[PDB]
Ligand binder design. Sequence first.
Ligand code: GAL
Ligand code: GAL
Ligand code: GAL
Ligand code: MG
Ligand code: MG
Ligand code: MG
Ligand code: MG
Ligand code: MG
Ligand code: NA
Ligand code: NA
Ligand code: NA
Ligand code: NA
Lengths: 204, 193, 1011
Amino acid sequence: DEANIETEGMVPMNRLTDDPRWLPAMSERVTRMVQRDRNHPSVIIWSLGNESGHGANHDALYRWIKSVDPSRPVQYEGGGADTTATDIICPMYARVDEDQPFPAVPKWSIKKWLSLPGETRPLILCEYAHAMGNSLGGFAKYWQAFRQYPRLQGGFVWDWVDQSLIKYDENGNPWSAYGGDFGDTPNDRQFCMNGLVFADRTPH
Amino acid sequence: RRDWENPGVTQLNRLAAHPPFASWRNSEEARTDRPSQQLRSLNGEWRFAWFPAPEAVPESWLECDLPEADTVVVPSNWQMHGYDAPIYTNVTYPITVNPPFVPTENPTGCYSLTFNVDESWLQEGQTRIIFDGVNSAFHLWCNGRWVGYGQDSRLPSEFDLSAFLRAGENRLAVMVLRWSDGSYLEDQDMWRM
Amino acid sequence: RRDWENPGVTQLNRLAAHPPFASWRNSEEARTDRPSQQLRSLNGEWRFAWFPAPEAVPESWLECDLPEADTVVVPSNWQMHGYDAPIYTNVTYPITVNPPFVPTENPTGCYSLTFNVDESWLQEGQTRIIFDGVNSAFHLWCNGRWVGYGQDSRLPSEFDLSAFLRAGENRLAVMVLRWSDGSYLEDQDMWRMSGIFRDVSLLHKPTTQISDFHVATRFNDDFSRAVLEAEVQMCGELRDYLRVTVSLWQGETQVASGTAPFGGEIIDERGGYADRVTLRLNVENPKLWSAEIPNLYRAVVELHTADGTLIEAEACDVGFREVRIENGLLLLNGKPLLIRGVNRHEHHPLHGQVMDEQTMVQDILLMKQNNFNAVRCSHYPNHPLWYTLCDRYGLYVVDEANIETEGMVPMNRLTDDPRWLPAMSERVTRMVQRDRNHPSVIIWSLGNESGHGANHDALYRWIKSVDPSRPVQYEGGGADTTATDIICPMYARVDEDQPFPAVPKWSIKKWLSLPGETRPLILCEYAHAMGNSLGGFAKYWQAFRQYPRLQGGFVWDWVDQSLIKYDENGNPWSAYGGDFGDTPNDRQFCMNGLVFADRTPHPALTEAKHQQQFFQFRLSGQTIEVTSEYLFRHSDNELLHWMVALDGKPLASGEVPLDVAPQGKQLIELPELPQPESAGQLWLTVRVVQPNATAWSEAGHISAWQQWRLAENLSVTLPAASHAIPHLTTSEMDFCIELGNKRWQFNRQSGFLSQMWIGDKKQLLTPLRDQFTRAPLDNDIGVSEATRIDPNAWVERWKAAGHYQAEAALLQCTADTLADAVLITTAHAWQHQGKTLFISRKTYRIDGSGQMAITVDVEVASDTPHPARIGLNCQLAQVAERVNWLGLGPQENYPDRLTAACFDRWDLPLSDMYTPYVFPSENGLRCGTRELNYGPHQWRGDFQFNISRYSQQQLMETSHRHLLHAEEGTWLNIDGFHMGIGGDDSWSPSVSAEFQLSAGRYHYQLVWCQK
Ligand SMILES: OC[C@H]1O[C@@H](O)[C@H](O)[C@@H](O)[C@H]1O
Ligand SMILES: OC[C@H]1O[C@@H](O)[C@H](O)[C@@H](O)[C@H]1O
Ligand SMILES: OC[C@H]1O[C@@H](O)[C@H](O)[C@@H](O)[C@H]1O
Ligand SMILES: [Mg+2]
Ligand SMILES: [Mg+2]
Ligand SMILES: [Mg+2]
Ligand SMILES: [Mg+2]
Ligand SMILES: [Mg+2]
Ligand code: NA
Ligand code: NA
Ligand code: NA
Ligand code: NA
């Protein structure tokens, strides 16, 4: 269960989440989610949101959930996937054997990540295997690794269904449309279609 | 007094969040998770009118239905009804990055509903309304009188209407703003509706 | 649209909090911390009008001054101006508890000010206004137009007036609401006031400005090297030609300096802060900061262009110090501290809660002079100047957020409610952003008495993320919750547990070793100094010194919160709860200081100074061993001063310079001390003296002292029998002994000495009778009131038992003649409703030398609350100017608070034998007295005493010290035994067992005579 908080557009990504002036707005998107869904057994982990760097607000809210509900682990990939605001190393798109040494927020090979000096948490990718179009190549490698490494406990494929919308031509026939197809601009082409199934739930 | 441009105001008169309620008046119904008489759905056909900004919303609307309005189904996204286009942007915000300000031209959706309340609901207890999802912020009026405000498109906003409702016909006025300071926290890579 | 009744709205258009700014336009002015042209003060005479509610404020006011208004000084509290009464309530909220709603009748103060702005301020840059303190919420208008709103009475609210001001005359309209939803978080046990009580300023900043800067100092393991890290953030137009240069100054010297363009390091996938830059300067062998030696540097932040043009400069004092809790201990620069602290409310007897430099410096000097090294901002951020002073004078500070809700039920009803997370958040975060650069601030506190809710944990973690340099603490919820790095109880006793459910107060010694516990323990409040208190104080320190992890505490508290009123004649007097028509009120519970509102020391302050000494001494024959308790300084401004005296009579003395390294020891070999001859007790007395004057001390200031009973010579040569012999005359109603000039009369109907004569001069105005009660001390009363009685309080236990109204029944009264003296034998039985409470057997022996030897032997029922005292008393007829005695003094001292007192010959004016506690009670006692001299009289033995013009009765019937009237003659209370005063807290029996008159059978002997 993930709070409604993404500010990936800001620069740096945590410009709001680290600003105490925004602690209130964020607070309510975390606390109200917990107070609402905390009784569902299917909810096993709480997430503080998505792509919003790592600000103090995240740490504050992290600790809140831990105080309010000890029954569930909290996780957050912002700021490098292994920040003090997450109980699980939850990177997104970190490869199996290859490192991607980005400054500040690198994506280590998931196998190398688990054994980094001092690290001890379990690692579950919050997003991996971008299924955009003819994709999912190398998927078997992830699982090979998941099964061999005790602390490599899986992940969440990205993602389920294509975010395509239905439009109609002059004849009144339906067709799948994406970025820009509605006069929307600026738009991000077809990047809204990353599913394992088409908008109409037909398997890829 | 623009509330959609102040991250300090995320709600006004909204009740506290909580687990799913149904207020059964019979334990057997509760155990079997059967429908509840105390939980009515206001889904269906509502009255809708699109505007270029909240400042274009005619006062009359608060008390009297606009004839220029259309009857549409709720819940729904007005983009899907063709009132304006749905935008698809990944990272780059759909609006200009200048927190906590949003465009002066803020697509405002005016939803209204005439429905009646059983007299027994007003003779006792509390009668509240629950909006499970309003994108991205909105103001609520019940019978011309103002009730409250709410933000956060993905969690329910609840308000106590007990003192606004009357037995019989009642009318809801819901001014929904497409953009708001809350949009700064809603930058997910999906269609922006 | 009521904003004062919505905890979701705590401000409107208020600018971001930040370290103190001045916007210097000259780097030299910044470095030298000289006044700034860009920082004007709007303090002075303003226009004020009071209203019953905001709804009564006439619109005209927004644009036109009300003629009905008055001209008053700002800052100030309108209660202090008499516009309405200041309320004094402890826990119970001053308003009705119904969050977030406040009374419809909300006292609204309307402040206005006409002032003009230089045209140059409006031609460029930003012009903002700064309200350092508005109690408790307010709306601001500039020239009729509305600007913003603000809450939180203890932190500054800033608004950008740039677009509201015009060149020339301008007018400010400030509507201040006394009550608001914010009042729910401001329930501290102090006078409840309101208004603009802190400075109002006008700051001009360039458009492209410095909007914030954080100073950090990290060292290597031995503090030989240190790296100063300065993160700077800007606003306005970003340009490459922009630069920031942070330079560190040690006096006129420039130890280091760094320059760099904006553009921080990459922090995440989106890059970094292009509007920030961090400078890192190296510092070799830095001068470390401490309360011992407040070594400071000057950090100057300059916003300029690459071509060298200064845009603006900001600065602050920097103190290189490292605070960290390691292995269970709180370390300051690697050494484990011993907090000799005190809690200090911002209170002025005439100005209400308005602070000024003078009052501050005064308090600071007094504190340091009485060996204090730390202070707790109970219970809200203090006036900005305070931190600056503590920085320079040297004081460890606990900066505490403005959050107390002790009135709620349960105490954490709000702090655990996520709906209130926002309001709380701002009272914590804004404090940190403001004071985080002050080196004197060593610990952050989350507030006071507000239970333990999730909000506390959330905010706890925030500070830890934002500022790793300081430990966070909070006593709420049991003092050892997950929201505190330090076990910080309040009033937890030394050896005795107080097993309260949920939130017990364990013996501080037992607390440290509780299974799993490992943190350091520092009481945030202990030794409630209310009235005649601080008994058992020495026990705390004994323990602090023995236990590594018992690192001190903060006494409660500094100054009495009494206000000055005037009677018909126009004379000033100290007033407290209720004295202003305020009700409900909490009596005198606002007076818990070590000093009176006017900073005059209480007797207890002296005890504190002594127990908190930084030099410990031990004696072994001829050698005195001095151990230093300092962690950094050397005793480079001290010399030991010793002196031997036989029962007051000095014999030898001298002085050795002190050369002790911190933590070190020094041995001092006294010369072959003078060999006494006469009978008596030799007393070695050492005093540490500061020859040179400091910034806080006069020259020759005394920082410590200690006494030792050297040798003793019991007198064996009993008196030379005079040939005269007393004559006994006998009536049926009296026994009269005459000897030369003197005449003694014992009323055979009472069994007490009813009168004595020295010529045709009477000596007593009231018979010499036994006494087992005392004018109840605040600690004896606790929270027991007229209507609400606390059956547990000592005063009630006594009352119920009947001690205050015991009829003295005579059992025997005989007289016999001896070979050289008359002998009167008495025996009384004090009872109440049949129950025999006390029995007092005595024998008076008047001999040829004309000396009366009174021998008392009392019995106390082993099932009647232990008596407050066991002695005698009578109203003498004389009224002398001085009092001389050989015993513990010079100041007031009681059994459980007499360590600081010294044994010697003391002489003082009758008045100094009376302690002016605002709330009258037993006082002025002096223990361990072998000789007392008053007028023609002299009493000898081994007793305690208090002598004044007020009877115990008057004292216990009078509520204020100003309603006390001198009585005929002088009342003498001579105790053979006196119960301790206690004080571990003032709301429950707090007198240690060893100080309770429980022996059952007591015995003392006195010798009355004419000197
Ligand atoms: O479709 C590309 C994806 O990239 C991820 O980093 C992001 O978290 C997803 O929400 C989506 O934007
Ligand atoms: O003397 C009563 C004291 O009790 C303390 O618990 C409180 O923190 C103080 O502010 C004061 O109310
Ligand atoms: O602060 C702790 C205690 O302080 C006392 O003054 C008060 O009477 C008690 O009820 C409790 O509040
Ligand atoms: Mg808003
Ligand atoms: Mg994204
Ligand atoms: Mg408010
Ligand atoms: Mg209190
Ligand atoms: Mg001692
Ligand atoms: Na997508
Ligand atoms: Na210690
Ligand atoms: Na008090
Ligand atoms: Na010296």
